[PDB]
Design a protein around this ligand. Structure first.
Ligand SMILES: CN(C)c1ccc(S(=O)(=O)Nc2cc3c(c(O)c2O)C(=O)c2ccccc2C3=O)cc1
Ligand SMILES: [Cl-]
Lengths: 239, 233
């Protein structure tokens, strides 16, 4: 049974603010840092060993991975970063909080975005306060026109994440190398939905907790042999 | 003019940098960590941008690089780890201080080792406390029996570092990628010795400062245009 571990970044400084980050490069909160530290300790107590690590190009994910590698004494592992594991790109909502979003669009429209699988938020325009910050960041310079989002539905996000899963991670798994993925809830959703063959509707009430290791046991066709297990103390897994 | 940056890690735990730390995977002491922070701030204040990073598979170098990348807000950079930028492998001497080495091997052999460029230290005996720790660490599992050092002269270390420089780093530089290297005193000595065409005698007396960015300006043939420049105070 192949062992695959997934983890969502610990709590971000904007998670505290209820503020939409998307492709904005928000750092971990101190609490989020401790979440990743404890997840790491859970992985160490269980004696987990990895051979390669995949992550996004966003610091909350990357720092979660670093803290885990520190905890499990495996800082020497290969790490691969890709924009394809990025958070979903929330377009115009980027930088706004719950209240601002509601005030601008109404609770009906927010409800629809919350429930829909294929309806994108409004796009991030050039006069948007974070337009340069995200769209002109040199880390995306090698992205084509079509590849660089102005906004994403979950469907979109999943659609650009899965080719990385298929071409870069699946070959590693079949080669028998134990993979650790540190990413975001919505990019991880693509992976979960593909593994468990979930529905559009089902994958949307799937909420992945921040900073908690998720273990999959896969067979030769990479289908789970059992449901996902959360890792950590009893207090933690209790939630 | 290509820009190349080197940085040697700072102080390791338990005074290990004065106890031949070699391939023992010692972490930075808090002081060494702080050195990496100051180097990071120096690169940040100067507005340096990199495109790719190289380091060893040893904890102290890797944490130095993490600290720098944090400081210059470029944690998203691609990072490549290689045993070929490791510290020199001091074999049986690893972990011992001057007195202990002198006492174990005699001062004749010690005299030879301090001055020689190509005389290797003796290998790790099975009763050596780091024997299994280093020689059976899975990070070196893909090394052939001939590749896996039991002990290295400075010549050895340089000899296994230069192929990585030629095959993996030189192509990035010719393509215009701005390279940051976070490594160890002796492997960085290999790279400096290759860049400046220095002699054995000259390279053995060159000591690179710790926790401070070392800047090279290279020409289209990757020769330095000017001497190495330190960044900082
Ligand atoms: C920005 N942050 C941290 C944040 C924003 C909104 C909320 S909320 O209103 O209380 N609940 C809540 C709200 C939302 C979502 C979602 O999964 C969710 O659980 C979405 O997936 C979602 C997707 C696309 C547009 C809007 C939403 C949305 O507004 C909770 C947190
Ligand atoms: Cl890394």
């Amino acid at each position: 049974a192949y062992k695959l571990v997934l983890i969502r970044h610990g709590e971000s400084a904007w998670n505290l603010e209820n503020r939409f980050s998307g492709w904005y490069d928000a750092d971990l909160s101190p609490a989020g840092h401790e979440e990743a530290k404890r997840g790491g300790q859970a992985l160490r107590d269980a004696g987990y060993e990895f051979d390669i690590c995949f992550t996004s190009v966003q610091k909350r994910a990357i720092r979660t991975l670093w803290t885990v590698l520190d905890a499990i004494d495996q800082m020497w592992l290969p790490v691969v970063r890709t924009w394809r594991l990025n958070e979903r790109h929330y377009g115009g909502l980027t930088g706004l909080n719950k209240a601002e979003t509601a005030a601008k669009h109404g609770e009906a429209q927010v409800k629809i975005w919350r429930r829909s699988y294929d309806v994108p938020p409004p796009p991030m325009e050039p006069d948007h306060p974070f337009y340069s910050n995200i769209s002109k960041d040199r880390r995306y310079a090698d992205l084509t026109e079509d590849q660089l989002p102005s906004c994403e539905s979950l469907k979109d996000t999943i659609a650009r994440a899965l080719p990385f899963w298929n071409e870069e991670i699946v070959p590693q798994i079949k080669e028998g190398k134990r993979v650790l993925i540190a990413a975001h809830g919505n990019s991880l959703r693509g992976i979960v939905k593909h593994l468990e063959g979930l529905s559009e509707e089902a994958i949307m009430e799937l909420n992945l907790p921040t900073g908690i290791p998720i273990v999959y046991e896969l067979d030769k066709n990479l289908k789970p042999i059992k449901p996902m297990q959360f890792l950590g103390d009893e207090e933690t897994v209790r939630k």
